Design a protein around this ligand. Structure first.
Ligand code: DGT
Ligand code: CA
Ligand code: CA
Ligand code: CA
Length: 341
DNA sequence: GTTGGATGGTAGG
DNA sequence: CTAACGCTACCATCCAACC
């Protein structure tokens, strides 16, 4: 088969610039103000202008504003952005029907039936790039491979604003060359676990017995790599099924007091149930971010579905349960619904 | 023991 | 208040209850 992974470039920022052309060419940091103090927040993302100075997603604003104070600091609007993503998705659905929407800014089409070889595959790659450009004035990165995984690595190499194929000549090359941290699904804990065993490339994993591999990075991780390294990896594109919908929010100051904490919780619950839409969940989870940034979960499942009124009375139970079993304060709190019908 | 739950980890550049 | 927002998938661990 043939997969055509597609990730939009510096998404949220590039939407702001589509809506505000004067921003083009300047640094633009899309932010997430928590309003605990002035400019308490986080950078959601920043255009490649601003990245050159090291303002990258995840860092604090106040720190970003050091690095670049004169850059254009816009606030995150998730709803403006989804609408776009949604519009762009329905263009991608012109080309293939089999489309998997991995994230807010990326998808895999299975263009197997639509093309006979990479040449054509790529040519469609250029076609997508252009329509999205003419229709939505956004620039994307196309990545093409025989499977999902190499599709992704392809477009890691490619981005920004680039198309990039990985034929077999290649795949088999990278299996004995590409360093193992570049394999998606392989973070840092895995990075260390693997270096310990002297495993730096996919090729290393069929010169080592399965059974140790399992007892060091887990079974599920092992088999996958082994598969990839044998190049027998066939894990097909298939429609998303949102398995959970959550929301967690930040408090003006940290707290242990239920009266202090409740109004925030209830906001997330309202916002969560609205996200849900038609879906009915079997399980709730109150989630806490502690003062020193541990993440603390408490949940329950029900045999039957969870009404909104159930969710309110229940969340508070769990929140007390949290307050009980850990003595720390709370920076953020929220809920996460799961196990739909 | 054999699942399906409860809690946490790792990763998503 | 003094830095760390926001979102989801999936796997591993401990463990409690039916074959
Ligand atoms: N709130 C928040 N949003 C994020 C975070 N990371 C990513 N996002 C949102 C904003 C991004 O524009 C979008 C997609 O992220 P990507 O991984 O694809 O990178 P991005 O789109 O910013 O540009 P990319 O080509 O890497 O350069 O998702 C994060 O840490 N926090
Ligand atoms: Ca992107
Ligand atoms: Ca992405
Ligand atoms: Ca990695």
């Amino acid at each position: 088969g043939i997969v055509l992974f597609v990730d939009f470039d510096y998404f949220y920022a590039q939407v702001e610039e589509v809506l505000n052309p004067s921003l083009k060419g300047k640094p633009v940091v899309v932010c997430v103000f928590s309003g605990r103090f002035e400019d308490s927040g986080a950078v959601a993302t920043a255009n490649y202008e601003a990245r050159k100075f090291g303002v990258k997603a995840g860092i604090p604003i106040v720190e970003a504003k050091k690095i670049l104070p004169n850059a254009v600091y816009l606030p995150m609007r998730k709803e403006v952005y989804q609408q776009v993503s949604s519009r762009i998705m329905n263009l991608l659905r012109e080309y293939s029907e089999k489309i998997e929407i991995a994230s807010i800014d990326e998808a895999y089409l299975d263009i197997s039936d639509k093309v006979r070889d990479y040449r054509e595959a790529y040519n469609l790659g250029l076609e997508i790039k252009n329509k999205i450009l003419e229709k939505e004035k956004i620039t994307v990165t196309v990545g093409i491979s025989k499977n999902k995984v190499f599709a992704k690595i392809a477009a890691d190499m490619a981005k920004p604003n680039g198309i990039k194929v990985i034929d077999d000549e290649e795949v088999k090359r990278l299996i004995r060359e590409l360093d193992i941290a570049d394999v998606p699904g392989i973070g840092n804990i895995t990075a260390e676990k693997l270096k310990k065993l002297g495993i730096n490339k996919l090729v290393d994993t069929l010169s080592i017995e399965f059974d140790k591999l399992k007892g060091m990075i887990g079974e599920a991780k092992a088999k996958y790599l082994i598969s990839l390294a044998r190049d027998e990896y066939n894990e097909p594109i298939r429609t998303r099924v949102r398995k959970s919908i959550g929301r967690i929010v930040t408090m003006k100051r940290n707290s242990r007091n239920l009266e202090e904490i409740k109004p925030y919780l209830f906001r997330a619950i309202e916002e969560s149930y609205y996200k849900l839409d038609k879906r009915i969940p079997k399980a709730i989870h109150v989630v806490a971010v502690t003062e020193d940034l541990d993440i603390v979960s408490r949940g329950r499942t029900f045999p039957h579905g969870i009404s909104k009124e159930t969710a309110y009375s229940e969340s508070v139970k769990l929140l007390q349960k949290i307050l009980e079993e850990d003595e720390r304060k709370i920076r953020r709190i929220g809920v996460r619904f799961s196990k739909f019908i």
